[PDB]
Structure 1
Amino acid sequence: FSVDGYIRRAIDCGFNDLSQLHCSYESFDVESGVYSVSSFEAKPSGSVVEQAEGVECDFSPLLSGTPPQVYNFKRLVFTNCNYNLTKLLSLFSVNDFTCSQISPAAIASNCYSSLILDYFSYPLSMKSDLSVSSAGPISQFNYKQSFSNPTCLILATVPHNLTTITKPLKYSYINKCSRLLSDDRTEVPQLVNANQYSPCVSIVPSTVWEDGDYYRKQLSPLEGGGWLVASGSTVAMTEQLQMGFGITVQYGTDTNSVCPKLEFANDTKIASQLGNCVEYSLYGVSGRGVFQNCTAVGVRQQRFVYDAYQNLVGYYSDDGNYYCLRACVSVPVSVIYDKETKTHATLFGSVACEHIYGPLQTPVGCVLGLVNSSLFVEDCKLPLGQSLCALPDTPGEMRLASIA
């Protein structure tokens, strides 16, 4: 920016390595020297994908008979299957579908180790009682979602023509659940744990007969003694049954085999892209790398082989082969710059020139912009390493000189 504010000169900081240098010092004039700059990135040349492909995950149970009350929720656990939430959601009039610790787009598109679906009858009038922040009876004694795993909650109404789902007489819930200790002075509220059933489930009937019913069980000494007690409550039934569906997903306890179905191209196979840098998604595991055919190590049944820094370093494919996985590797870059001549050369340290006058292979890497001179110096200003030096022609190209 000039004094009058106009821009008269600029550097595109991603144009080349010399430009990166000027930008890092925020100046158009930097001192002579050899500087490290951002590496020349390897970029993906394609992608490989492997997903479980097969059986649909089965939501049929859900659709047949009278759903349980909130404290007796039923659980469907899906593993090793293709999921489709639209397939289930489309059967209900959804009133409220929200997600936590997972985006909306993600719930319907990511692969999981497992998907757990908890379904139950639930009045919509008590919607708020399922909130994480709630201190009412549902969240304290009946049903609580995980705080650790990503979850979604769907509240939906059963359509008049979905005749396979029947209604209970009333909606019901536990409004009290507690233990009376052996002294019969102290009463301890028994709160429901996330993803678990309340201890009072065994004393509370599948349908509370009437609001205010009190239940009691004498506990054995192995259960700590005393009494387990509970109180039920009811909500009048609606014209259409309202149901809640909790969804909990886990991301890495097993192969993430619960995936949306995918139509596979045969150009996304690993064997067809060996040696290339590709993006990968293997049963929910993703990143970038290079696959190589190699000797199997690790336990085959476990599929993914990890190193001591927890990187994925190998994989057993469903095509029967074991592949080594290497990172797409970046190519080191150092800029050799001479301020007086306004010239430069690029050193790719540690890199053979097969990956890059043409390029010159030197003891410290591959260098472009230098010409081999078979000349010696003592007075080296731009040392390259080992006993090599860049020597400006003064302008011409820099010479590669040896230090005497």
Structure 2
Amino acid sequence: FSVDGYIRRAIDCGFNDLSQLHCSYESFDVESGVYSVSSFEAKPSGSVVEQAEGVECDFSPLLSGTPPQVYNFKRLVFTNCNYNLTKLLSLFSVNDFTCSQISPAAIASNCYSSLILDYFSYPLSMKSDLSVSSAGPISQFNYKQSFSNPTCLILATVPHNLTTITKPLKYSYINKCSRLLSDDRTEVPQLVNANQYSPCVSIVPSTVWEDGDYYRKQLSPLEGGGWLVASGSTVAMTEQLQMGFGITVQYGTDTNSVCPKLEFANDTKIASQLGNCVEYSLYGVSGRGVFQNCTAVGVRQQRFVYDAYQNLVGYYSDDGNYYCLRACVSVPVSVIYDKETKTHATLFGSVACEHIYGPLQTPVGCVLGLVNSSLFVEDCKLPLGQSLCALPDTPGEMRLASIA
């Protein structure tokens, strides 16, 4: 910016390595020297994908008979299957579908180790009682979602023509659940744990007969003694049954085999892209790398082989082969710059020139912009390493000189 504010000169900081240098010092004039700059990135040349492909995950149970009350929720656990939430959601009039610790787009598109679906009858009038922040009876004694795993909650109404789902007489819930200790002075509220059933489930009937019913069980000594007690409550039934569906997903306890179905191209196979840098998504595991055919190590049944820094370093494919996985590797870059001549050369340290006058292979890497001179110096200003030096022609190209 000039004094009058106009821009008269600029550097595109991603144009080349010399430009990166000027930008890092925020100046158009930097001192002579050899500087490290951002590496020349390897970029993906394609992608490989492997997903479980097969059986649909089965939501049929859900659709047949009278759903349980909130404290007796039923659980469907899906593993090793193709899921489709639209397939289930489309059967209900959804009133409220929200997600936590997972985006909306993600719930319907990511692969999981497992998907757990908890379904139950639930009045919509008590919607708020399922909130994480709630201190009412549902969240304290009946049903609580995980705080650790990503979850979604769907509240939906059963359509008049979905005749396979029947209604209970009333909606019901536990409004009290507690233990009376052996002294019969102290009463301890028994709160429901996330993803678990309340201890009072065994004393509370599948339908509370009437609001205010009190239940009691004498506990054995192995259960700590005393009494387990509970109180039920009811909500009048609606014209259409309202149901809640909790969804909990886990991301890495097993192969993430619960995936949306995918139509596979045969150009996304690993064997067809060996040696290339590709993006990968293997049963929910993703990143970038290069696959190589190699000797199997690790336990085959476990599929993914990890190193001591927890990187994925190998994989057993469903095509029967074991592949080594290497990172797409970046190519080191150092800029050799001479301020007086306004010239430069690029050193790719540690890199053979097969990956890059043409390029010159030197003891410290591959260098472009230098010409081999078979000349010696003592007075080296731009040392390259080992006993090599860049020597400006003064302008011409820099010479590669040896230090005497």
Aligned to 1:295: 295
- Per-residue deviation at 1:222? 0.0
In 1, the alpha carbon distance for the partners of 2:303 and 2:188 equals 47
- Per-residue deviation at 1:170? 0.0
In 2, the alpha carbon distance for the partners of 1:362 and 1:336 equals 14
- Per-residue deviation at 1:157? 0.0
Q: Secondary structure at the match of 1:77?
A: strand
In 2, the alpha carbon distance for the partners of 1:288 and 1:137 equals 48
In 1, the alpha carbon distance for the partners of 2:58 and 2:242 equals 21
Deviations 1:51-88 (A, max 9, x none): 00000000000000000000000000000000000000
- Per-residue deviation at 1:328? 0.0
Q: Secondary structure at the match of 1:132?
A: coil
- Per-residue deviation at 1:131? 0.0
- Per-residue deviation at 1:167? 0.0
What pairs up with 1:103-114 in 2 under 5 angstroms? Answer: 103-114=103-114
In 2, the alpha carbon distance for the partners of 1:14 and 1:183 equals 76
- Per-residue deviation at 1:378? 0.0
- Per-residue deviation at 1:146? 0.0
Deviations 1:212-257 (A, max 9, x none): 0000000000000000000000000000000000000000000000
In 1, the alpha carbon distance for the partners of 2:2 and 2:174 equals 74
In 1, the alpha carbon distance for the partners of 2:256 and 2:39 equals 33
- Per-residue deviation at 1:203? 0.0
- Per-residue deviation at 1:105? 0.0
- Per-residue deviation at 1:155? 0.0
In 2, the alpha carbon distance for the partners of 1:276 and 1:26 equals 36
- Per-residue deviation at 1:295? 0.0
Deviations 1:280-309 (A, max 9, x none): 000000000000000000000000000000
Deviations 1:177-206 (A, max 9, x none): 000000000000000000000000000000
In 1, the alpha carbon distance for the partners of 2:270 and 2:352 equals 26
- Per-residue deviation at 1:333? 0.0
In 2, the alpha carbon distance for the partners of 1:377 and 1:266 equals 57
In 2, the alpha carbon distance for the partners of 1:23 and 1:161 equals 66
In 1, the alpha carbon distance for the partners of 2:139 and 2:204 equals 17
**Is 1:317 aligned to residue 317 of structure 2?**
yes
TM-score by length of 2: 1.00
Deviations 1:131-177 (A, max 9, x none): 00000000000000000000000000000000000000000000000
Aligned to 2:208: 208
Aligned to 1:371: 371
TM-score by length of 1: 1.00
**Is 1:17 aligned to residue 17 of structure 2?**
yes
In 1, the alpha carbon distance for the partners of 2:71 and 2:237 equals 17
In 2, the alpha carbon distance for the partners of 1:230 and 1:190 equals 10
- Per-residue deviation at 1:387? 0.0
- Per-residue deviation at 1:392? 0.0
Deviations 1:85-138 (A, max 9, x none): 000000000000000000000000000000000000000000000000000000
In 2, the alpha carbon distance for the partners of 1:386 and 1:96 equals 68
Q: How many residues align?
A: 404
In 2, the alpha carbon distance for the partners of 1:370 and 1:73 equals 74
In 2, the alpha carbon distance for the partners of 1:232 and 1:257 equals 40
- Per-residue deviation at 1:209? 0.0
In 2, the alpha carbon distance for the partners of 1:261 and 1:328 equals 28
In 1, the alpha carbon distance for the partners of 2:361 and 2:172 equals 79
In 2, the alpha carbon distance for the partners of 1:42 and 1:155 equals 47
Q: Secondary structure at the match of 1:296?
A: coil
Aligned to 1:37: 37
- Per-residue deviation at 1:317? 0.0
What pairs up with 1:60-75 in 2 under 5 angstroms? Answer: 60-75=60-75
- Per-residue deviation at 1:274? 0.0
In 2, the alpha carbon distance for the partners of 1:265 and 1:159 equals 39
Q: Secondary structure at the match of 1:249?
A: strand
- Per-residue deviation at 1:403? 0.0
Structure 1 stretches of at least 4 aligned residues deviating more than 2 Å after TM superposition: none
In 1, the alpha carbon distance for the partners of 2:73 and 2:45 equals 48
- Per-residue deviation at 1:326? 0.0
RMSD of equivalent CA atoms: 0.0
Q: Secondary structure at the match of 1:252?
A: coil
In 2, the alpha carbon distance for the partners of 1:242 and 1:200 equals 24
In 1, the alpha carbon distance for the partners of 2:84 and 2:106 equals 12
Structure 2 unpaired stretches of 5+: none
Q: Secondary structure at the match of 2:234?
A: strand
Q: Secondary structure at the match of 2:49?
A: strand
Structure 1 unpaired stretches of 5+: none
In 2, the alpha carbon distance for the partners of 1:93 and 1:276 equals 48
Aligned to 1:340: 340
Deviations 1:4-55 (A, max 9, x none): 0000000000000000000000000000000000000000000000000000
Q: Secondary structure at the match of 1:197?
A: coil
- Per-residue deviation at 1:279? 0.0
Q: Secondary structure at the match of 1:336?
A: strand
- Per-residue deviation at 1:313? 0.0
- Per-residue deviation at 1:389? 0.0
In 1, the alpha carbon distance for the partners of 2:360 and 2:66 equals 78
